[PDB]
Amino acid sequence: PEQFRIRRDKRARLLAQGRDPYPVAVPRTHTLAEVRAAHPDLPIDTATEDIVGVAGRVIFARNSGKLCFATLQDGDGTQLQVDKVGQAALDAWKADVDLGDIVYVHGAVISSRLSVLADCWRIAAKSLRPLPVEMSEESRVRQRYVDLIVRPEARAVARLRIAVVRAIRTALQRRGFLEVETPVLQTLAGGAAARPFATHSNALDIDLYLRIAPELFLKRCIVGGFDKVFELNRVFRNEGADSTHSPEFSMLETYQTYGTYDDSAVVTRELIQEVADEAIGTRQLPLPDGSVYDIDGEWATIQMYPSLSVALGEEITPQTTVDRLRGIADSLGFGHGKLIEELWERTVGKSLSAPTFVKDFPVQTTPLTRQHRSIPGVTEKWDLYLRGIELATGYSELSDPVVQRERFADQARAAAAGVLDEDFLAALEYGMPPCTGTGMGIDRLLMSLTGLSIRETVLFPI
Amino acid sequence: PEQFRIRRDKRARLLAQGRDPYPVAVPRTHTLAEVRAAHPDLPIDTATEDIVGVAGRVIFARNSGKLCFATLQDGDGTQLQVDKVGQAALDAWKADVDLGDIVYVHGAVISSRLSVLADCWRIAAKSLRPLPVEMSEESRVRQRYVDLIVRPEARAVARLRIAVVRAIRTALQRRGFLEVETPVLQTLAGGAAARPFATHSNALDIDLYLRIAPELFLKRCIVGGFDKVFELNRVFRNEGADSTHSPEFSMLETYQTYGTYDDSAVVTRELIQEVADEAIGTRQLPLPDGSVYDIDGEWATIQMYPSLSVALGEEITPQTTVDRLRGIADSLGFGHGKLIEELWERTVGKSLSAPTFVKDFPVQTTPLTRQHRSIPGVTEKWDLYLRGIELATGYSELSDPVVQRERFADQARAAAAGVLDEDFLAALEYGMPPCTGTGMGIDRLLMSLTGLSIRETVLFPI
Ligand SMILES: CCOc1nc(N)nc2c1C(=O)N([C@@H]1CCCC[C@@H]1O)C2
Numbered sequence A, B: 001p002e003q004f005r006i007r008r009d010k011r012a013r014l015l016a017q018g019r020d021p022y023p024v025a026v027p028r029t030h031t032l033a034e035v036r037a038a039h040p041d042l043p044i045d046t047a048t049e050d051i052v053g054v055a056g057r058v059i060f061a062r063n064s065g066k067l068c069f070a071t072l073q074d075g076d077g078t079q080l081q082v083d084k085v086g087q088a089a090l091d092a093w094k095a096d097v098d099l100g101d102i103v104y105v106h107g108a109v110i111s112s113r114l115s116v117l118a119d120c121w122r123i124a125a126k127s128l129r130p131l132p133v134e135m136s137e138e139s140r141v142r143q144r145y146v147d148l149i150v151r152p153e154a155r156a157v158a159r160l161r162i163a164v165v166r167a168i169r170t171a172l173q174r175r176g177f178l179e180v181e182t183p184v185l186q187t188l189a190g191g192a193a194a195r196p197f198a199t200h201s202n203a204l205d206i207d208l209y210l211r212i213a214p215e216l217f218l219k220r221c222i223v224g225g226f227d228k229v230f231e232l233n234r235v236f237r238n239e240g241a242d243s244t245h246s247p248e249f250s251m252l253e254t255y256q257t258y259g260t261y262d263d264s265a266v267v268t269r270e271l272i273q274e275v276a277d278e279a280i281g282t283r284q285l286p287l288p289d290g291s292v293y294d295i296d297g298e299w300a301t302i303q304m305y306p307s308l309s310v311a312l313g314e315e316i317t318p319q320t321t322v323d324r325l326r327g328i329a330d331s332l333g334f335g336h337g338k339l340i341e342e343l344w345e346r347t348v349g350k351s352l353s354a355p356t357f358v359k360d361f362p363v364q365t366t367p368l369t370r371q372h373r374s375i376p377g378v379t380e381k382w383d384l385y386l387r388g389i390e391l392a393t394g395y396s397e398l399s400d401p402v403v404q405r406e407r408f409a410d411q412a413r414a415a416a417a418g419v420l421d422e423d424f425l426a427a428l429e430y431g432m433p434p435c436t437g438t439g440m441g442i443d444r445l446l447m448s449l450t451g452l453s454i455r456e457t458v459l460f461p462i
C-alpha cells in the first residue's frame, strides 16, 4: 500500500538523473527459452563464451555485498537467474531495483555452483506496484495481467485456448473449409432463441442488434455457392450468466453442402479428437478430480423419444399430448417440444457420463432444421453431450422456404401481443443445396476438456 | 414477377406427388471442378466409363425433343453441361425444371460434339425466384447471395478477401505470433478516438460499449507476458460512412516486445508483400484503371514536420504556434496537432503516389505512443499511405504510466463540460516491456490492393 509511493520516488529520481526507466529500445538478442534450449547440460560451475542480451522480470532477489542474485522470468514463464563492470552498477542495482521490474542484461552465460553475468544492464520498465505473492478466483479474473505473471496455470490455459483454436482452424482448413466474416450489427438478429443486445446508430437514426448467431448469413453464403464455410467468432445473447452461460462468447458454426447430420456428427467427433491431440496430446483427459475422461474411439448415438420412453417406462412420441407430458412432468418435479426436451434433459440427459449424441428432436423446437426423412413429427438435429455438457448441435438444414416461412409464423404468433426475416426467406427461395450446419461453444469445449470454469477459459470476462 | 407463382405451383405438385424437392441427402460423388481436373483433354465426342454423381445449378437450358441440354454451375463457378433411362424422365425434365434450380445427376462422363448423361437424376432444390440476367451496385450488395451466383467478380473477391486473411494469419504465425481474443463489450471503450455504440445489459442494469479497438486489452496481454500477439477481428466506431469509413469493420492489431516503430514498419511492409504474393501472385498490382501499382522492393520514409516544412516553403516544428498554423491553414482553404496533420494531409498527404511511411507525429494527437527518443515534441508513430490510402499505423508504445495518466487528463479536460481507464493504468504500473503496436484496416488493405469499393470488399454491409 505504502511502497506504492516509494516506487514512484524511484522513477522520478531516474528521470531527473537522465537515466531512462521506459526506454524505447533495448537490444535483446535471445529469449530465456532460446538460451535454455541452446544450453541444456553445461558442466555446472564451468563457463562458455556465448555473449547474449536477455530481458526478463526480476521476481526473486538476494542482494548481498559485492554480489546480488535474482531470478529473471520471461513472460512465457521461463527462468534464468543473474568485477564484471562497475560498483556504481551494484549501487544502482541495490538502490534502484525492486521486484516485478523488467530488466535487460548483457553478458556471457554460465552455470551456477544457469544464470548470466553482466557486461551491461539497464531497466526496461519500473513497476510502481509490487506483485502480490494469494488472490480470489474473482480478483484473479479482474486482473488477468497479474494472474498471468504470478500464476503459471493462468499461462498454460491462455496458451491452450489459443492452441485449441488454431487446431480447429487447422482441421477445418485441412478439410477444405473457408472461414468467412458476416455482420455483427444486424437489422434484426436471428439464428437462435435469445434476447439480443440493441444499440442505437447515430448515422441511421435507428436501432441495431448484435448477432446472437451467424447461421442466417452463413446460409446466404451456401446459397451464393459456398461448398464449405465456417465462422469462428463472437456472439451476443442478452441473458443470464451461469456455469455454462455468458452473454458474449466465442462460437464455431460450420456448413457442408451435400451431407446430413449423420456426416456432421462424424466430423464433429473427429474435429474434437484432433483438437485434443494437437492442443493436449492425449484423448485420456486428466482432470482436477484426479480422474481421466476417455474420448477416444467411437461415441454413442441415441434418439430423444426412444431414450426418454425407456426412461419413463412408457412410450412417448410426437403424438403424446401436452397434458400427459405436463402430468409426467409433475410426477417428477408451455408446449410439447419444451416438455420433451425438459423431460429428456431432466431424466436421460443428466444421467450420461461418456460422450453421446442424441438425435431426432421435436420439430416444435427446431424451426431451422429439416423434417426427419422417414420418422414423422421430428427433425434431423443432434446435440452432443460431452462429460455432461451440451457442447454442440448439428442439423440437416431446412432448405424448403415455404415450410421455413410457416415455421416462423408459428414462432411469431407464439410471442405476439395483438415481423419476419423476409430477406432470409428471399435467400432461400433462390435455392439452397442440401447441407448440414453445426454449432459449437468454445468455452464449453475447453470446459468439457479440462474441468476449468468458464471464467478461466477466457482472458477477460465480466 | 408472375412466374414467381408458377414455381410455387411446380413445388406443390411435387409434394402431393410424393417426389421430394428439398431432399435431405443426394449422393454426390464429385465437384464439377474435380471432374474437370480429372478429365482435361478427352477426345471430343468419344466416351469414358467413369460413372460419377455431380450436383449443380441449371443456368442454361435448351430443351428440344428427345434431348434436353443444360449448363450446370458448381457454386464455385465451374461449369459442366448435361435412351439413357426413361421418357417420363424427359417429361419431368421439360415440365418440372426451370433455371436457378439445383440438380443432381448420376452417370458417365463424355465429350460433346464436356457434359454428362444420366443414369439417374433428381431435384436438390426448386428455386421459386428466377435469377435476373443487370443490377445496381447497391441492389447487388443487398442481395450478395444472387450477386455471387450470377456475377463471377463477386465470387473471386469474396474468395480473395478470405485468401488474404489466411495469408495474414499464415505470416504472423510464421513469425511466432499468437492470435488472442479480447472483449467486445467493455465497461468503457478505449484504444482510439471514436464514438462507441452503447447497449443496455438486462443482467447488470448497466450500459456497455462495443470496442472501438483492442489495444488496451492487447497491451494488458503484453504486460501478462505475451511476447507477440495479434487479434484480427471486428471493431465498431459509431460515426459516418464514406469511401474509407464504415461503422463496423475488421481490423488487424499487432504487438511485439523488444522492437520499435522502425522494426514494425519493416514487418508491416513484408506482411503486406507476402499477402499480395499469396493471395494475388504479383506485386505489380493490376487495376480497373488499366494501370499497375508497384509495391515491390523498398518504400520511402519521411518525417511529418520536415516533409510539411518543405511543402509550405517554411520551417514548421513542435514549436510553431496555433496562430501561425491557423493562418497558413487559411492561406490555403482546435489545436496544434490537429492542424499539423490537417496541413500535412492537405498538402503532402494527398500528393503521394508510391508506398510511403510518414513518421514522427505531433504528441498532441498520439496519447498512446511513446515520446520520440531524441527529437522533442513528437512521438514514434508512423502512418503507411498506400496508393493514396491510410492503411496502417505503427507505434513505439508508451509504456510509462504516469506520463500516460497525464496524457489522458489532458485529453479528458479537452471534452469536459464542468473518468479514466484506471484499470488500464493499473495494468501499466505493473510493468510493460518496450514494444511496438500496429493497426491495419482489412478493407482498406484490399481496397488499396485492388481499387474495389469498400462496399465490394465485404460480404454483407449496410
Ligand atoms: C461459454 C458460454 O457459452 C454459452 N453462453 C450462452 N449464453 N449460450 C450458449 C453458450 C454456448 O456454448 N452455447 C452453444 C451454442 C451452440 C450449440 C451448443 C451450445 O448451446 C449456447
Ligand SMILES: CCOc1nc(N)nc2c1C(=O)N([C@@H]1CCCC[C@@H]1O)C2
Residues within 6 Å of the ligand: B237, B239, B244, B245, B246, B247, B249, B251, B390, B391, B392, B393, B439, B440, B441, B442, B443, B444, B454
Ligand atoms: C473499411 C472501413 O475502415 C474504417 N472505418 C472506420 N470507420 N475507421 C477506420 C477504418 C480503418 O480502416 N481504420 C484504420 C484503423 C487502423 C489504422 C489505419 C486506419 O485508420 C480506421
Ligand SMILES: N[C@@H](CCCC[NH3+])C(=O)O
Residues within 6 Å of the ligand: A191, A192, A212, A213, A215, A253, A393, A394, A395, A397, A436, A437, A438, A439, A440
Ligand atoms: N445456429 C445454431 C448453431 C448451428 C446449428 C446448425 N445449423 C445455434 O445457435 O445453436
Ligand SMILES: N[C@@H](CCCC[NH3+])C(=O)O
Residues within 6 Å of the ligand: B191, B192, B212, B213, B215, B253, B393, B394, B395, B397, B436, B437, B438, B439, B440
Ligand atoms: N489502436 C490503434 C491501432 C494500433 C496502434 C499501435 N499501438 C488504432 O485504433 O488505430
